Amino acid sequence: GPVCAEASDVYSPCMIASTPPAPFSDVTAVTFDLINGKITPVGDDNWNTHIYNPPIMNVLRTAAWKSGTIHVQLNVRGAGVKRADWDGQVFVYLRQSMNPESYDARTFVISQPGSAMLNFSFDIIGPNSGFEFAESPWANQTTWYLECVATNPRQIQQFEVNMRFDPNFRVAGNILMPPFPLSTETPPL
Amino acid sequence: GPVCAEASDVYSPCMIASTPPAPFSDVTAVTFDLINGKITPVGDDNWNTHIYNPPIMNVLRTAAWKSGTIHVQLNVRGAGVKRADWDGQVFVYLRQSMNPESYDARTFVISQPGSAMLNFSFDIIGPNSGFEFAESPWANQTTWYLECVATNPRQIQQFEVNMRFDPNFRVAGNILMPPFPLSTETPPL
Amino acid sequence: ENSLEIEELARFAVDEHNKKENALLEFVRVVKAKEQVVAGTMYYLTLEAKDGGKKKLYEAKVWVKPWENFKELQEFKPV
Amino acid sequence: MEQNLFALSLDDTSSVRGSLLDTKFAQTRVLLSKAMAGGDVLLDEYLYDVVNGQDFRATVAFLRTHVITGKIKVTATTNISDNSGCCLMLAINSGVRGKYSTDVYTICSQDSMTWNPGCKKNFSFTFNPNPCGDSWSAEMISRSRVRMTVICVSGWTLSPTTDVIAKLDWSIVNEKCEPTIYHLADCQNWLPLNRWMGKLTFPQGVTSEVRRMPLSIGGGAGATQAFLANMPNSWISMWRYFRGELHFEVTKMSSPYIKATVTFLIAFGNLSDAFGFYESFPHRIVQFAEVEEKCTLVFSQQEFVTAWSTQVNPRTTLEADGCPYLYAIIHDSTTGTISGDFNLGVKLVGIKDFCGIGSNPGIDGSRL
Amino acid sequence: RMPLSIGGGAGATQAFLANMPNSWISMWRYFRGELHFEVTKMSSPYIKATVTFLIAFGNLSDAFGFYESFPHRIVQFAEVEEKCTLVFSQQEFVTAWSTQVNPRTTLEADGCPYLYAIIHDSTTGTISGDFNLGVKLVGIKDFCGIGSNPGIDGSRL
Amino acid sequence: MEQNLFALSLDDTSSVRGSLLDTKFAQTRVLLSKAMAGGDVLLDEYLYDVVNGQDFRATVAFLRTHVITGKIKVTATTNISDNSGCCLMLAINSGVRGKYSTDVYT
């Protein structure tokens, strides 16, 4: 900055996770299963989570075998907190598995006050002619999780994971999913 | 910024170094031997260091002769310190050798509050048909160190060195290493 | 060894053991089966059964005369 | 005499092959209840659990052959008197997630046969259980959790005297396993879908029966405060607008005794019922014989001016909805000596010369 | 059983050992190829045994008596012969499999292939002593490495 | 799609054939005692009772094929150190009568 680059593309919002309400001050985290569309908060912290249903998410949930790059944009709001009093940071971690033994594939570290953005990507690639069935016992294939940590949940209000397929993306096969409930984005007045 | 570029690749975390606990306020430093995977803190400062065992690190430790570019991502956390009270800075220095006579190959200088990231790269290149045996007396070959300085260790909690081979990377030959202990990343709740 | 026949014989083992010894083992599956031609066929089975909801392995010996409806549990024991 | 055992042909990695007798690997016994309803799971098990407790010629070859380059043929030898009829649908899906929907809509995508026992004595169809490669194995499909599902989409129009059974015969034929891979090219020559456009009930009588099925297919099919999803239907909703030659496959689900003649046409939602001039539009008449059960409507590029939207807002009425519908109109009247509705199942097989425009942000809902 | 998820070293105490080439193959996530083993006799010629080798998955128990349904290779050694090369072509593997697996996965739920070594008859001899036999994966022909391993940290499966 | 089921190849009266893997139909386990004598029956069963409790590639083909024009190969993979040796004899006879002699001669 101060002059920006140029964002261009259509990224659809998949998964929001609002942070637990007052007086909960302790450090906390959440995990977005990027492929299977699930949001498991750590411990017994009452995060307020929603999974929306844009076409990207419906494909990622129903498609069995997947291949190629998906671009993510993690947005962070944002409580109305005086800039000089801000001490909140956000550590994120891409992971293959959610087991203790597995390592991170990427770490990011953000301490921008109020709000932040974080574009990254990663290639789903798998054994079966370049395709990956997420979490299949076959070949011990695994997903991609996105562990995210709010060091100060009083100041960080919510995470938000937007996604987009690169044009190289390819799926095959169907999974029988249950009926998806109609959760809608409550836009801010 | 405010709109970011786009991180893409798989960087595996190699070496963490947490900073000495209270009341230790003085300026301090640490050195990551990037190739041989060792973490020597300066003086008698009790830093809390760990070397993890992703495939990159195991190759760098066992491979004798190496050639080509490795990309590093140095992440810095990050104590919960009010942004207007932050005075901590981070000087880093690539070096060939750790002797007083040798000069730096690169210096970076960061004073971003809370947290920071720093991507750079460097090419391992050596005498023996472009290959470098790290720290061999032959041809007085040398490693690459990464000296890092926390001016305020109360505010800087920890360093973290992630790494990735460029596709041009090449090794040859084996070294008999001792058994690597199983240290695992303690992920933050 | 036809796996369908062996599955039925393994269930018969657990059922006969339950009748004979007043037990309530819950059949899970066959692990191993040996057929040995004799006067009829003798079967040596290795199988999983739940005791108190706890999976355990058992050996069973089952004698069949295929020309009659004769099936006889000769022995049944944990391995 | 002695021989060198290392050099024998015991590492034979051939696929399973031969006649249909020597490639059969399982038979399965489905029970059809005397009084079964629509949307009724008859069988639902993993495709590998089919082969448990089996002793056919290729059963052990199937389990132990590491690679199989041939497809799986399944044939179903179920029959019933012409008097009655129903509609069964067998269908293979690459996996599951807990508490799943078994509505015909959800299932049909991917690989399926649909047949009416009343008309067709038997029905066979081949498929590849690994949809993104030339090969597969028994160990692949056991651990991948490939799921076979038989469903009754329309009940018996006249119930039989007793319960019925459908014998499925699982074999391995020797066709090449070709993969079906969806991708994000804007222009594609053939985008298969197998999208269940809907079951059309027409009651017996005299009234103007008209049924609209919207061609804004994307964004799933409805439920309670919920919606269902195939993959291919979710895939087409990646794009905002689209067009192409649409290849429907309309199928009889009632018995041959319930007779009716059906006009199909493309047209827009504003047209009311009791508008008596549907045959001004270009249309296609569909009479079924006793024996015929299946008929393919195609609608060329001349039926559509522009592309239309993949999804529409749920609250748009028929009055203000500018995407095309597929009308299905009774040309005469639904008749028969026996009581029962004239059921009819439409299935968008695929879009030829598909052209997908733009990039859908998405809508969230289903019907229009 | 010897697992073909070879990557991430071999075990020790709370530790693991590493070659370079084995650490190198674990750079990739999934892989495949013609595997060229080199099985060697380590006991004397007097201890005699016949050994079937085959690729198969972990679920198969011991006391499952139909291993020769799978494609396999028999290995008898003469007095003078000491070394024999098993090759397993591309038709033995459907897809690629993972280089590393989590240590806590049991044999029941582990979808990578193993290399079984099964005694075809019985271990015999006039003199006492075990029938030792050393298997060494020499190399992978037509190697195809997929993806990019974040890593796992452990060894055996 | 439908097909005429009467005209399929389900009345295939081929013999069993293929590689040695796909024609294997049973394996048998004979126990040789540490101290065995001469004139000592190790195994003695009907040739059809060999195939009971078996699950090899040609086991079901063998039982169900009405005619087999091929011979039966049997191979015996038993070994022992050159130091020792014995003499086994496997042998097939078209039938029996009660309380039979199992002398090598017979």
Residue numbers in the entry:
A (entry chain A), B (entry chain D): 1 to 189
C (entry chain C): 32 to 110
D (entry chain B): 1 to 368
E (entry chain E): 212 to 368
F (entry chain G): 1 to 106
Which passages does the manuscript contain on this structure?
For this analysis we used Cowpea Mosaic Virus (CPMV), a plant virus from the order Picornavirales that has been used extensively in biotechnology and as a model for single-stranded RNA viruses more generally. Affimer proteins are novel affinity reagents which mimic the molecular recognition of antibodies, but can be isolated quickly and produced recombinantly. Affimer proteins are small (11 kDa, 3 nm in diameter), stable (70 °C < Tm < over 100 °C), monomeric proteins that lack disulphide bonds. Their structure consists of a single α-helix and four β-strands, with the molecular recognition sites being located within two variable loops, each up to nine amino acids in length. We have analysed the structure of CPMV in complex with the Affimer reagent using cryoEM revealing the binding site of the Affimer at the 2-fold symmetry axis of the viral capsid to the L subunit.
